[PDB]
Design a protein around this ligand. Structure first.
Ligand SMILES: N=C(N)NCCCCCCN1CC[C@]23c4c5ccc(O)c4O[C@H]2c2nc4ccccc4cc2C[C@@]3(O)[C@H]1C5
Lengths: 339, 218, 54, 232, 283
């Protein structure tokens, strides 16, 4: 009969943390930013359109140099674009055409992808031969690869559909660490700027912050009412933003362990597929399923702009390291670069 | 443009041409998604050709088929089923030999899965090829175990034909908005090689329908 | 059975963190967004010559 | 990666000869291929270029209309048909592979070369230094001047630095005036602007004795320079 | 004293010319800015619209010919107009025939159709159709000399001129009307039989919502072709065979009414595309 006692203890600890969070809450960020000058409207237009994909684009990632990018489509293709001149640098076939994530190594020597085959494939782009060959195939996830980001050239972190995250050493192809605790399917993964902590959003309406070196969850955030599909970090590493299928973005803070803002509108009934900040963190760009992106003021919770011009659901969007452009990849088999 | 810039453009055009050729070859290809319960029987339908999801490629009557099995994916279907929105057909394997076995009746679980997949928002006009497996076991089992266990409102003859037709009709009745949906029903016989041919016929119809969408008189 | 003990231990570990007030976090976010507003090519219009995407 | 040359030999003027290059160890069909010749006592001059897919073909002015360059991709082999041979064609011929995309490594590998002997404007590229004595453990700077500025409007300076050891094929050191080559130690440094460029060896070893060449890739016909020999 | 007839024929010509020009311009604008030309059906409708646009250019010329019965535009524009008429007639008829054959392939042979119906193949056979009518348009422009108590502009066949004219007219009737109508009827009938066998049968909605509509569209296309091309062909045949008062204003009015029916077919094909093609109706 100790299960009931343990459940009561868990409820008591939940009440304790809720009381502590309520005691730490004094004034909302909206009240503080009621006196800061807003931006009336931003107007970003398409400077570049990248064509060549023959199926739905499911992921894209920028390079560190903010000129090269990698896009993944479910036609079995991973394309490296030179965004400046609309040039295709590499077209990598995949053994499995079911790809839901792609990553660019910070050094630019490797790319990664994965999906319904439960395998994270790492491809080497700088070979003595002129082709791009597969460097390794990390296996050991019982669910589909939802996201993957590069710690460095030898370390990778993967989010999967078996309610687990993993940290792999690429050279040995083995799981250095496994992060467990999520009740539902982990759908997103964002790395901190110092790249020592990472947040993962899952289908149990929960975002968890993990320490990579130690391997345990530091804090758990639960404000959403549906499955979180997108996660991203503030540029200062002390806050993050989550998008879910309840049509609401939410900005949480780490050192306060609360939610700071909610970005929602009564005219939006569709989910959020991907979110991304700006370089200064003033703008939050969120891709929706109603075929267009919305640009919110991160401190004023106002829809500062709309990025329309996609004929299908915006699956991914990214912002360059220097903040010069925003690249959106939707299901209409096109990528659009906005400035 | 400098010389290496022109050569880079030439490289881009070459791999664009290769991309177009690969896309045409993939567009000449028909897609089947295989679905069913664990004990329903799928290995009997993939053995008549002669971790992760599994692919089976075969060729019948100058037509290339890929069949995807997602039975090893123990996760939420609602987050990767839109990857199969463009498939030509979905094959659903339902066993007839497990009407009296509970593993909750597992045939009722098959009906629930069929209802969830058929009325999905991503499968508004995707054809169902319903294969009802284990007819010999059904004939050997219906002679002693009645169909009242799975269906209380049977009220019919306890023979093979009546019970089989009742089960088939109970599976057809789960199809809401059946004007734009078509369900093909076949009874799986192990000692025959015509089963894939049936799929071929069903597949052909979809192409014809798609061709009626191509010339603007669908 | 041990999953309940594991989650109780995890909740106890997560309950002991020191939390700063919401005012401090709000001021930190405002200071970051005001100390990098000039170096934001999307918040402010960019010159045509300096724009790599023409 | 092997580029083995074959053919060559002794011919009479007015004859014809086919030079063959067998490629192994790399994707031949994706690369562009150059034929570059070297006179018995002179430097290198560029002869011919075929692109990937055999779409773009360039020739030098002294060889136009007499030589043809072809490429068999299933056989992984490169041909140079040679007609109306004269006394200026006595040379050692080199096959060079070059791949062209963003951040590429052109002119990276050179074949051994085959010897052909017979019976008896554009950008002018100058290297003022010649036969410079050097000492081990000391830095040395090699200069290269151009008639036209190599700095394109996209921010790329199209200067390539090559090294030829005695009795050996040339090897690539610098791609575009700043960039080190793969397998090259961090002792060579490229710098310069406009028409004037320098290559600095910070510490000199015993394997750096050879002839250094600077080439332009801004526009065809891809002029090389003279030799900057250093041997001590 | 056929002033009312002259005004009516001029008004009909102006109406069909304006309607055809507007419809072809709208079809071009739609195929440019609505759906990219990436399907064989779009390719065929594009080239049919281009043929109709080139054909709907001699309306003032025949209007002036009917009004004044005197050709002031010389052997040069006689040759140009006659060559344009022959070329566009053959091109449009062959494009309709190829559309019917393409639909028959798409329905009755789907496995081979997913390989044959490439946009590149469609462009190839359509260009072949365009250039095969050049072999008919070139002799018309090469050999057509005016010879005016009547200003008359028509082809000067060598001796035996009557034999050559009869051969030319019989050939144009057997290779511009009879063979295309047979091919269109056979292809559409076999396609409709195949669609009857296709599981669009049964149900209270499928049959009368799809198969009846497809049969209606096929019947209206074939009927438009027949009732808008047959009268002028049969009038040409009876004018060559049976003697009649070629100087009668009523006979001239009947000729120009048949010409108006042909130009009405040219202006009515985009009407059928706009108000009957389900792809254009949806998208
Ligand atoms: N949709 C389009 N693609 N186009 C728009 C409609 C174009 C209609 C006019 C086409 N045009 C072609 C040439 C012509 C003619 C015709 C039939 C049989 C024949 O053998 C013949 O040859 C010529 C002729 N010769 C005649 C010779 C003597 C007397 C009268 C003649 C009338 C015609 C009508 C003709 O001009 C007529 C039909």
């Amino acid at each position: 009969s100790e299960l009931d006692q343990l459940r009561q203890e868990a409820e008591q600890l939940k009440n304790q943390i809720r009381d502590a969070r309520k005691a730490c809450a004094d004034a909302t960020l909206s009240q503080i930013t009621n006196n800061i000058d807003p931006v009336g409207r931003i107007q970003m237009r398409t400077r570049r359109t990248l064509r060549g994909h023959l199926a739905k684009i499911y992921a894209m990632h920028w390079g560190t140099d903010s000129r090269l990018l990698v896009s993944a489509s479910q036609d079995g293709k991973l394309i490296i674009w030179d965004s400046y001149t609309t040039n295709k640098v590499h077209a990598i076939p995949l053994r499995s055409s079911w790809v839901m994530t792609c990553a660019y190594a910070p050094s630019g020597n490797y790319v990664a992808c994965g999906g319904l085959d439960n395998i994270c494939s790492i491809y080497n782009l700088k070979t003595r031969e002129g082709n791009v060959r597969v460097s390794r195939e990390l296996a050991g996830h019982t669910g589909y690869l939802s996201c993957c980001r590069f710690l460095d050239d030898n370390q990778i972190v993967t989010s999967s559909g078996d309610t687990t995250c993993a940290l792999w050493d690429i050279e040995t192809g083995q799981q250095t660490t496994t992060f467990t605790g999520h009740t539902g399917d982990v759908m997103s993964l964002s790395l901190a700027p110092d790249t020592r902590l990472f947040v993962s959003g899952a289908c149990d309406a929960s975002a968890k912050l993990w320490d990579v070196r130690e391997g345990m969850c530091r804090q758990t955030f639960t404000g959403h009412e549906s499955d979180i599909n997108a996660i991203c970090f503030f540029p200062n590493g002390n806050a993050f933003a989550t998008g879910s299928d309840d049509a609401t973005c939410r900005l949480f803070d780490l050192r306060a362990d609360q939610e700071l803002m909610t970005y929602s509108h009564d005219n939006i009934i569709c989910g959020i597929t991907s979110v991304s900040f700006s370089k200064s963190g003033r703008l939050l760009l969120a891709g929706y399923d109603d075929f267009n992106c919305n640009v919110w003021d991160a401190l004023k919770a106002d829809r500062a702009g709309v990025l329309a011009g996609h004929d299908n659901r915006v699956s991914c969007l990214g912002v360059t390291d220097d903040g010069m452009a925003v690249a959106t990849g939707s299901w209409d088999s096109f990528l659009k670069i906005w400035n | 443009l400098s010389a290496e810039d022109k050569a880079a453009v030439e490289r881009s055009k070459m791999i664009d041409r290769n991309l177009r050729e690969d896309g045409e070859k993939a567009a000449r290809e028909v897609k089947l998604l295989l679905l069913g319960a664990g004990e329903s029987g799928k290995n009997t339908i993939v053995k008549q050709m002669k971790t992760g999801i599994v692919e089976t490629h075969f060729t019948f009557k100058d037509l290339h088929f890929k069949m995807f099995d997602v039975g090893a994916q123990r996760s939420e279907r609602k987050k990767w089923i839109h990857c199969f929105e463009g498939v030509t057909a979905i094959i659903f394997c339902v066993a007839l030999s497990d009407y009296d076995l509970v593993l909750m009746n597992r045939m009722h679980a098959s009906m629930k899965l069929f209802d969830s997949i058929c009325n999905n928002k991503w499968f508004t006009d995707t054809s169902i090829i319903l294969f009802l497996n284990k007819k010999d076991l059904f004939e050997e089992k219906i002679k002693k175990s009645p169909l009242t266990i799975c269906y209380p409102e049977y009220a019919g003859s306890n023979t093979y034909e009546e019970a089989a037709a009742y089960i088939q009709c109970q599976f057809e009745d789960l199809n809401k908005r059946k004007d734009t949906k078509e369900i093909y029903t076949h009874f799986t016989c192990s000692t025959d090689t015509k089963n894939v041919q049936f799929v071929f016929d069903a597949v052909t119809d979809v192409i014809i329908k798609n061709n009626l969408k191509d010339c603007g008189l669908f | 059975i041990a999953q309940a003990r594991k989650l109780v231990e995890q909740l106890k570990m997560e309950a002991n963190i020191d939390r700063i007030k919401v005012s401090k976090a709000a001021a930190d976010l405002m200071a970051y967004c005001e100390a990098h507003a000039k170096e934001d090519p999307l918040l402010t219009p960019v010159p045509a010559s300096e724009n790599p995407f023409r | 990666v092997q580029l083995v040359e074959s053919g060559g030999g002794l011919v009479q003027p007015g004859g014809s000869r086919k030079l063959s290059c067998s490629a192994s160890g790399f994707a031949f069909s994706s690369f562009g291929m150059h034929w570059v010749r070297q006179a018995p006592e002179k430097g290198l001059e560029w002869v011919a270029y075929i692109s990937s897919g055999s779409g773009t073909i360039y020739y030098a002015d002294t060889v136009k209309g007499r030589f043809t360059i072809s490429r068999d991709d299933p056989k992984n082999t490169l041909f140079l048909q040679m007609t109306s041979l004269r006394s200026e064609d006595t040379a050692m011929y080199y096959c060079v592979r070059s791949i062209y995309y963003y951040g590429s490594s052109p002119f990276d590998f050179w074949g051994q070369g085959t010897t052909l002997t017979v019976s008896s404007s554009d950008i002018v590229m100058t290297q003022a230094t010649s036969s410079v004595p050097v000492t081990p453990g000391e830095s040395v700077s090699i200069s290269c001047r151009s008639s036209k500025s190599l700095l394109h409007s996209n921010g790329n300076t199209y200067l390539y630095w090559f090294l030829q050891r005695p009795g050996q094929s040339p090897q690539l050191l610098i791609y575009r005036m700043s960039n080190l080559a793969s397998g090259v130690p961090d002792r060579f440094s490229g710098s310069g602007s406009g028409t004037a460029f320098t290559l600095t060896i910070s510490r000199l070893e015993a394997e750096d004795v050879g002839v250094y060449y600077c080439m332009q890739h801004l526009e065809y016909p891809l002029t090389f320079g003279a030799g900057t020999k250093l041997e001590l | 004293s056929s002033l009312a007839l002259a005004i009516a024929i001029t008004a009909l010509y102006s109406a069909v010319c304006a309607v055809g020009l507007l419809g072809n311009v709208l079809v071009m604008f739609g195929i440019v800015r609505y759906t990219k030309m990436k399907t064989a059906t779009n390719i065929y409708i594009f080239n049919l619209a281009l043929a109709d646009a080139l054909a709907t250019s001699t309306l003032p010329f025949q209007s002036a010919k009917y009004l004044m019965e005197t050709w002031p535009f010389g052997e040069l524009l006689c040759k140009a107009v006659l060559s344009i008429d022959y070329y566009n007639m053959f091109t449009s008829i062959f494009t309709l025939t190829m559309m019917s054959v393409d639909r028959y392939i798409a329905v009755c042979h789907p496995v081979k159709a997913l390989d044959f119906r490439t946009p590149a193949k469609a462009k190839l056979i359509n260009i072949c159709i365009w250039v095969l009518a050049s072999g008919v348009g070139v002799p018309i422009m090469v050999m057509a000399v005016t010879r005016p108590g009547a200003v008359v502009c028509m082809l000067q066949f060598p001796s035996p001129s009557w034999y050559w004219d009869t051969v030319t007219k019989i050939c144009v009737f057997l290779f511009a009307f009879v063979v295309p109508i047979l091919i269109i009827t056979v292809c559409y009938g076999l396609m409709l039989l195949r669609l009857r066998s296709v599981r669009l049968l049964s149900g209270s909605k499928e049959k009368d919502r799809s198969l009846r509509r497809i049969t209606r569209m096929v019947l209206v296309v074939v009927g438009a072709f027949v009732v808008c091309w047959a009268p002028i062909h049969i009038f040409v045949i009876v004018w060559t065979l049976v003697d009649i008062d070629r100087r009668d204003p009523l006979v001239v009015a009947a000729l120009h009414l048949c010409i108006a029916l042909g130009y009405a077919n040219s202006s009515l094909n985009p009407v059928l595309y706009a108000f009957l093609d389900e792809n254009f109706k949806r998208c």
